[PDB]
Amino acid sequence: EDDWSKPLPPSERLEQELFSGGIPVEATGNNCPPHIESFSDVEMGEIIMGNIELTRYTRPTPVQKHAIPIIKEKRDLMACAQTGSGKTAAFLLPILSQIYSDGPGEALRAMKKQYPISLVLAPTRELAVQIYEEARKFSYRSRVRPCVVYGGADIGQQIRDLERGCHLLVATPGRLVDMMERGKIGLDFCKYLVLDEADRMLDMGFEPQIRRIVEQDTMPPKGVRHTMMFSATFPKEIQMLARDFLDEYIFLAVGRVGSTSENITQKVVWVEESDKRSFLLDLLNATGKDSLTLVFVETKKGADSLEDFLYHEGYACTSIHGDRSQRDREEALHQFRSGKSPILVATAVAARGLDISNVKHVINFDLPSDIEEYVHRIGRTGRVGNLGLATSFFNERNINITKDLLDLLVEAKQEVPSWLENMAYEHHYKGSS
Ligand SMILES: Nc1ncnc2c1ncn2[C@@H]1O[C@H](COP(=O)(O)O)[C@@H](O)[C@H]1O
C-alpha cells in the first residue's frame, strides 16, 4: 500500500511558485494538552517540517503554540483569535500532519464522487483562497491535493478541478451544498471539519447551509470527526453552535475576544416613510469614487421601487430580490463586486449566502423587527483596517426595537440621538417622590 508519510519528489518550479512571496492567552477545558514553544516540541512528520522551513516559519505564533498540540491530540477546539494571528496554519499544520501519518483510511484505498478527508468552511471567496494557498504550501511533496470552491464563479471549472482529486476541500457553504446536490462531493469520510471566521459566516446568513452540511448529510458525528471553530467574536449564536458541533473541547482565547459590531460607525436618523427616498439621495451624494454601498429594504416590491427611483435619478445601481431570475441576480452581484454598479439594493433574505465583500457603507433603508438581524446586516461592513459605516432609517414602525438598538449603540460606544434615548425612557425606574 501507499506511504503517505514519506515525501514525494520535489519540483523547484513549483517551489518558486509556492514559497517566493511575502498578548494574553486563555485556555480552558478538560485535560488540555500543554502548549508548545517550538514546532519540534511535537512530532508533525517529515513532510510538514520540510514545508515549514520552505515557508520560513521559525517559531509558532501564540495561537499556534496552543492550538497545534490541541488538534494533534485529537481534541475539539473553539478558538477566539483575530486575523494575522496565524490561525490558518494553526489548523492546517496538525490536520495535514495526521493525514500523512494515518493515511487515507481503508475506505479510500478500497475505492482508489469525491470524498474529502478534511473540510474547511469559509464565509468569502477571498478567505477561501487564502486558506487554499496556505494548504498548497503544506501539502507540497505530499499526496494530499487541496481544492477550493466558492460562489460567484464558474461551477464547471470548479467541478473539473474537484475531479482531479481533493483530500482537503476549502469551501463557502453555498457552493459546497451545490456540489453535494450535484453528486460531486460525499462527506462519508470527512474526519476534519474546520469553521474559519464562523461569526461572519452567520452574519452572512450561512447557518442553515452549515447545519445542513454538518448535521443533515453523511458527515461523521462529533466524537468521530474532529471539529475546530475559529471566530474573532463570541456571540450567543456562536456559543450555541460550539455546543452543538463540538465534543469535549478546549476553549482558546488569544487576546481579548472581539466585541459585537466592532470597527463600525453606526448612525441612526429619524425618517418618515415618505422621505426615505430623498434622504437616501443625500447619503449617496457623500459617497466616494467607488466605495460599495449596500442598501437593505424589507420587501421585494420595495427593492424594485427603490432601484427604479435610483435609476431615474441617474445613479449606477442594481438590485437583488426573490422576484428576479437567477441569471439576473448573479450578474447583479457581479456588477456590484466589480464596481460597475456600486449601489446594491437588496432584501435581507435575498442577501443570504451571497459573497458581498464587506462594503464601505451599509444603509438600513428599512430597519428589521429584530436586533439580531440588525447585527447581522451591519456586519456586512467593517473589517480591521477599514472602519465601516452603517446608517439606519428609523420611524414609528421601528418603535419595538427602540431599547435594543439604544443598548447596542451604547455598548458599541456610538453616538446616540437624543430623541432615541428619550423615546426609550421608562418612568418606573425614577422612584417615589
Ligand atoms: N509561525 C509563523 N511565523 C511567521 N508568520 C506566520 C506564522 N504563522 C502564520 N504566519 C503568517 O500570518 C498570516 C496568516 O494570518 P491568519 O489570518 O491568522 O492565518 C500569513 O501572512 C502567514 O504567513
Query: Got the DSSP string for 167-191?
Result: SEEEE-HHHHHHHHHTT-B--TT--
| Residue 232 sits in the same domain as residue 356 | no
How far is ligand 1, taken at its centre, from the CA of residue 160, in Å? 30
Q: Name the strands in the sheet holding 317-320, side by side, starting at the edge strand that comes first in the sequence.
A: 264-270, 388-394, 361-364, 293-297, 343-347, 317-320
Residue 220 marked as a ligand binder? no
User: Rounded to whole angstroms, how far apart are CA atoms 264 and 171?
Assistant: 27
- Pocket flag, ligand 1, residue 62 (CB < 6 Å): no
Contact 114, 163 (CB under 8 A): yes
| Residue 231 sits in the same domain as residue 341 | no
Q: Which atom of ligand 1 is nearest to the CA of 61?
A: 1
Q: Which of 255, 287, 309 is the last residue of a domain?
A: 255
User: Rounded to whole angstroms, how far apart are CA atoms 137 and 156?
Assistant: 25
| Residue 59 sits in the same domain as residue 89 | yes
Residues pairing with 25 in the sheet: 254
Residue 227 marked as a ligand binder? no
Question: How many domains are there within the chain?
Answer: 2
Residue 305 marked as a ligand binder? no
Residue span of the structural domain in which 353 resides: 256-433
- Pocket flag, ligand 1, residue 61 (CB < 6 Å): yes
Query: What length does the chain have?
Result: 433
| Residue 275 sits in the same domain as residue 358 | yes
Instruction: Count CB neighbours of 4 within 10 A.
Output: 19
Residue nearest to atom 9 of ligand 1 (CA): 86
Residue 57 marked as a ligand binder? yes
- C-alpha cell, 48: 510538514
What's the start-to-end Cα distance of the chain, in Å?
87
Residue nearest to atom 5 of ligand 1 (CA): 57
Q: Give phi and psi for 388, each to the nearest 5.
A: -95, 165
Identify the residue whose cell numbers are 466616494: 288
Residue nearest to atom 21 of ligand 1 (CA): 84
User: Rounded to whole angstroms, how far apart are CA atoms 229 and 194?
Assistant: 6
| Residue 99 sits in the same domain as residue 23 | yes
Burial of 21 (0-12, 13-18, 19+ CB in 10 A): exposed
Which amino acid is located at 244 in the chain? D
Residue nearest to atom 14 of ligand 1 (CA): 86
Residue nearest to atom 8 of ligand 1 (CA): 86
Residue 172 marked as a ligand binder? no
| Residue 355 sits in the same domain as residue 380 | yes
Specified resolution (Å): 2.2
Residues pairing with 192 in the sheet: 118, 226
User: Rounded to whole angstroms, how far apart are CA atoms 351 and 333?
Assistant: 10
Residue 61 marked as a ligand binder? yes
Q: Give phi and psi for 70, each to the nearest 5.
A: -65, -50
Q: Give phi and psi for 347, each to the nearest 5.
A: -80, 150
Which amino acid is located at 152 in the chain? G
CA quadruple 311, 316, 320, 326: dihedral sign: positive
| Residue 261 sits in the same domain as residue 225 | no
User: Rounded to whole angstroms, how far apart are CA atoms 26 and 33?
Assistant: 13
Residue 115 marked as a ligand binder? no
How far is ligand 1, taken at its centre, from the CA of residue 55, in Å? 10
CATH number (domain holding residue 154): 3.40.50.300
Contact 83, 123 (CB under 8 A): no
| Residue 224 sits in the same domain as residue 271 | no
Q: What approach was used to elucidate this structure?
A: X-ray
| Residue 194 sits in the same domain as residue 276 | no
CA distances from 72 to 34, 43, 271, 355 (A): 11, 9, 55, 32
User: Rounded to whole angstroms, how far apart are CA atoms 206 and 198?
Assistant: 9
- Pocket flag, ligand 1, residue 354 (CB < 6 Å): no
Residue nearest to atom 4 of ligand 1 (CA): 57
Q: Which of 255, 271, 299 is the last residue of a domain?
A: 255
- Pocket flag, ligand 1, residue 253 (CB < 6 Å): no
Burial of 51 (0-12, 13-18, 19+ CB in 10 A): buried
- Pocket flag, ligand 1, residue 88 (CB < 6 Å): yes
With the most atoms of ligand 1 within 8 angstroms of its CB, the residue from 35, 57, 68, 124 to mutate is: 57
- Pocket flag, ligand 1, residue 255 (CB < 6 Å): no
- Pocket flag, ligand 1, residue 85 (CB < 6 Å): yes
Helix H segments across 166-275? Answer: 173-181, 198-203, 207-215, 236-245
| Residue 294 sits in the same domain as residue 162 | no
| Residue 85 sits in the same domain as residue 163 | yes
Q: Which of 90, 108, 107, 196 is nearest to 145 (CA)?
A: 108
How far is ligand 1, taken at its centre, from the CA of residue 254, in Å? 14
Q: Which of 255, 276, 306 is the last residue of a domain?
A: 255
3-state secondary structure 339-352: CCCCEEEEEHHHHC
Q: Give phi and psi for 378, each to the nearest 5.
A: -70, -15
| Residue 197 sits in the same domain as residue 333 | no
Which amino acid is located at 240 in the chain? M
Residue nearest to atom 7 of ligand 1 (CA): 86
- Pocket flag, ligand 1, residue 86 (CB < 6 Å): yes
User: Rounded to whole angstroms, how far apart are CA atoms 315 and 174?
Assistant: 31
The secondary structure element, H or E, covering residue 393 is strand 388-394
Residue nearest to atom 11 of ligand 1 (CA): 86
Residue nearest to atom 12 of ligand 1 (CA): 86
